[PDB]
Amino acid sequence: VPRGSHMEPLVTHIYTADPSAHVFDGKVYIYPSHDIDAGTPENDMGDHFDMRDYHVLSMNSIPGEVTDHGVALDIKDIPWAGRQLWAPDAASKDGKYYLYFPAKDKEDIFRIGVAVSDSPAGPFKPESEPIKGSYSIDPAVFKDDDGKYYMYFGGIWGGQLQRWTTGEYAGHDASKTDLEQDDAPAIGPRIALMSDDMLSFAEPVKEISIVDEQGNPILGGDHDRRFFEAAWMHKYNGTYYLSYSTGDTHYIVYATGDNPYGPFTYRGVILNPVIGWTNHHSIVEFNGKWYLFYHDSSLSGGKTHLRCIKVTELTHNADGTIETISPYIE
Numbered sequence: 144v145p146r147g148s149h150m151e152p153l154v155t156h157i158y159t160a161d162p163s164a165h166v167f168d169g170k171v172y173i174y175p176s177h178d179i180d181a182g183t184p185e186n187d188m189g190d191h192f193d194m195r196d197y198h199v200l201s202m203n204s205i206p207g208e209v210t211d212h213g214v215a216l217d218i219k220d221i222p223w224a225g226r227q228l229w230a231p232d233a234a235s236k237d238g239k240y241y242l243y244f245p246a247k248d249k250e251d252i253f254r255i256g257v258a259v260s261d262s263p264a265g266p267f268k269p270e271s272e273p274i275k276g277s278y279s280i281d282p283a284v285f286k287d288d289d290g291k292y293y294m295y296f297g298g299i300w301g302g303q304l305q306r307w308t309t310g311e312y313a314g315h316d317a318s319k320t321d322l323e324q325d326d327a328p329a330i331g332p333r334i335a336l337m338s339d340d341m342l343s344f345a346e347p348v349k350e351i352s353i354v355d356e357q358g359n360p361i362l363g364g365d366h367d368r369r370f371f372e373a374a375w376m377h378k379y380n381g382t383y384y385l386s387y388s389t390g391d392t393h394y395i396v397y398a399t400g401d402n403p404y405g406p407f408t409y410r411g412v413i414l415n416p417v418i419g420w421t422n423h424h425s426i427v428e429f430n431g432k433w434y435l436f437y438h439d440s441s442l443s444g445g446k447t448h449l450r451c452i453k454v455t456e457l458t459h460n461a462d463g464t465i466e467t468i469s470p471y472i473e
C-alpha cells in the first residue's frame with residue numbers, strides 16, 4: 144500500500160531510524176538504522192541503541208509503496224565490529240554502491256567502515272577493517288557537482304567525538320559530553336575528501352567551523368545551536384547547507400557556506416523537536432521536489448530507542464532560507 148502522504152510512519156513491520164535518503168536509478172533509496180527492543184541499559188552513552196543490522200528501503204514515488212530489501216549487512220559479518228550499528232549512509236560511484244556505517248570496534252571505540260555492493264539495495268560486503276583515520280559516528284557521504292565525494296561525520300556524548308582532539312582516542316575515562324569549556328568554540332563536525340576508490344580518506348581529517356550571523360564561533364554552552372550529531376550536506380542554488388541535530392535541545396538546524404569545508408553560518412531551525420529524544424534527518428531532491436526524511440518514537444508509544452521514519456515536503460525560499468517544519472501541526 145502507498146505511504147508518505149500525511150507524515151505517517153513509512154514502515155511499521157520493523158522499527159526504523161536515522162533515514163539517509165538518496166536518488167539512485169530513478170528511485171528513492173533510504174539507508175536507516177534498524178531499531179530493536181534489545182532491552183539494554185539506558186544511559187547518556189546510548190547503550191540502549193543496540194542495533195545489529197541494516198535493511199535498505201526504497202520508494203518509486205512519494206507517496207508510494209515502500210520496499211524492504213531484507214538484511215543488507217549484519218554485524219556478525221563485519222570482522223572488526225563488536226557492537227552497535229548506528230546511523231548509516233550510502234554513495235554510488237562508477238557502478239558500485241558503498242554503505243558507510245558507524246560501529247564500536249572491539250575496544251569499544253566508534254569507527255566508520257564501508258561495505259560494497261553492485262546494487263543500491265545491497266546486500267553489501269564489509270571491508271575487514273574500518274576506514275583508517277575515521278572515528279565517532281554518523282557519516283554523510285556527499286557527492287559534489289564536480290564529482291568529488293566528501294564524508295561528513297561525528298557525534299558528541301555517546302558518539303565519542305569529544306575524545307578525538309589529538310587524532311588518538313582519549314580513553315574510556317575521558318569526557319562523556321564535550322570539551323567542558325562552554326566559553327570556547329563548540330566542537331565541530333568532521334570532513335574528509337574520499338579517495339578515488341571510496342574506501343579511504345584522501346586527506347587528513349578537517350574540522351568544520353560553524354559561526355553565528357556576526358561571524359563569531361558558536362560556543363560550547365550554546366546547546367540550542369551547537370553541533371551534536373547527524374551531519375548532512377546538500378546544495379541549493381550553489382550554496383552548501385550543513386544541517387545537523389543539536390541533541391539535548393532536540394532541533395535539526397542548518398548553516399550555510401560557499402564550499403564543502405565551510406565555515407558555515409548558522410541560519411535557523413529545519414525541524415522542531417519530535418516524539419522521543421533523538422532527532423535525525425536527511426534532505427533530498429526527487430522529481431524536482433525537496434523532501435525532509437526524519438524519525439520519531441510515535442509508533443512505539445514514545446520509546447526513544449524504537450523509532451519510525453517519516454517524510455514531509457521541505458520548502459527553500461529563493462533567498463536560500465528554509466521554512467521551519469514543526470512535526471505535529473497539520
Ligand SMILES: O[C@@H]1[C@@H](O)[C@H](O[C@@H]2CO[C@@H](O)[C@H](O)[C@H]2O)OC[C@H]1O
Nearest residue numbers: 186187188189299300301302420421
Ligand atoms: O550518542 C548519543 C547519546 O549520547 C544520546 O544519549 C541521550 C542523552 O540524553 C538522555 O536523556 C537520553 O535518554 C539518551 O538517549 O542518545 C543518542 C546518541 O546518538
Ligand SMILES: OC[C@@H]1O[C@H](O)[C@H](O)[C@H]1O
Nearest residue numbers: 192229230372373421423
Ligand atoms: O540512532 C543511533 C544514534 O542516535 C542518533 O539518532 C544518532 O544520530 C544515531 O547514530
Ligand code: NA
Nearest residue numbers: 283373374375
Ligand atoms: Na546524516
Ligand code: NA
Nearest residue numbers: 411412466467
Ligand atoms: Na525558521
